[PDB]
Amino acid sequence: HWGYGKHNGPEHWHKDFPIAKGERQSPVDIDTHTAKYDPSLKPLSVSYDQATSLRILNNGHSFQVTFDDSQDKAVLKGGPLDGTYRLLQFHFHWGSLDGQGSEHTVDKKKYAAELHLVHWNTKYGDVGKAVQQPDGLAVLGIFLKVGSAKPGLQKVVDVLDSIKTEGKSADFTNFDPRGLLPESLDYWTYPGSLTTPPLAECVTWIVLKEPISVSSEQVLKFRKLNFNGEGEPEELMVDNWRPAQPLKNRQIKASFK
Ligand SMILES: Cc1ccccc1-c1ccc(S(N)(=O)=O)cc1
Ligand SMILES: [Zn+2]
């Protein structure tokens, strides 16, 4: 059904998911001169020391690394958030060439890729319930530019050949997501949505100002993945990003001056 091609891509999604044309859709362009510095915003608290990664999976739209979210082991707190959000999974969006791939943009600039660390609010008990609430999820977004390699990404890229096609998964234990984070936790924040179906308007977005650098060899491995299942015509998993959506009645706030 839905995907990123001409006949099933972002321009078509509203037919099955009418909230695609809603009031708080993501991603958006971050206009840095219009974002308001908010001195009342707290530093982000990222507590990933006890993270337990479980599996890595090709779901036909990205690859994701899933974590044990049955306890408060890897949590996001502080920043614009009230309460505690458990890390469920991370995944990426990327392009066919380095000049596109990110979902959020910064002054209309596109990065080569964007990492999403997906967390849900423990007050709702499970992610399915959280997706039905306006403060249900917090997604930490991190831009990728191409240059030097990111050592903490290498364990991920080295197993991608084992999950080439839709439906494949593998053990992916003892992965430390702290190795994917930039130095600074300075961020922009705004109320938005999931960027893939169901496009639910349940996300507090926290987008880091500082990109991480990854090497061309690392991104090339992303681009060898397939949208298709094994045995179906090969279609490279590239350009799996939704473009910027209308900001409408929203304010983007900055944690930094
Ligand atoms: C939370 C969720 C539940 C069921 C199906 C898809 C999702 C999901 C999670 C994260 C994103 S994003 N790309 O906004 O980080 C999109 C959908
Ligand atoms: Zn995403």
Resolution of the structure in the document, Å:
1.3
Integer Cα distance of 247 and 254 in angstroms? 16
Quote the DSSP letter at residue 138.
E
Q: Which two tokens stand for residue 28?
A: 């958006």
Distance CA 37, CA 232 (A): 49
Beta-bridge partner residues of 92: 115
Nearest in space to 135 (alpha carbons), one of 199, 205, 197: 205
Experimental method: X-ray
**Closest ligand by atom to 136 CA:** 1
Domain 1-257 listed as CATH 3.10.200.10: yes
Question: SS3 for 236?
Answer: strand
Give Cα separations from 106 to 27, 180, 197, 210, 214 (angstroms).
11, 20, 24, 11, 19
Distance CA 239, CA 230 (A): 20
Of ligand 1's listed atoms, the one at least distance from the Cα of 139 is 15
66 is in an annotated binding site: no
Decide: 145 and 209 in contact? Cβ < 8 Å: no
- Please give the structure tokens belonging to residue 255: 């944690």
The atom of ligand 1 lying closest to the CA of 26 is 14
- Across 133-160, b (16+ Cβ under 10 Å) vs e yields eebbbbbbbbbbbbeeebebbebbbebb
Catalytic residue IDs: 61
DSSP assignments along 5-69, one per residue: STTTSTTTGGGT-GGGGSSS-S--EE-TTTSEE-TTPPPEEEE-TT--EEEEEE-SS-EEEEE--
The domain spans of the chain are 1-257
- 45 pairs with which residues across the strands? 77
Q: Is 89 in the pocket of ligand 1 (CB under 6 A)?
A: no
Question: How many helices, marked H, and strands, marked E, lie in the chain?
Answer: 3, 15
Nearest to 123 by CA among 85, 94, 95, 96: 85
Name the residue among 108, 111, 129 with its Cα closest to residue 120.
129
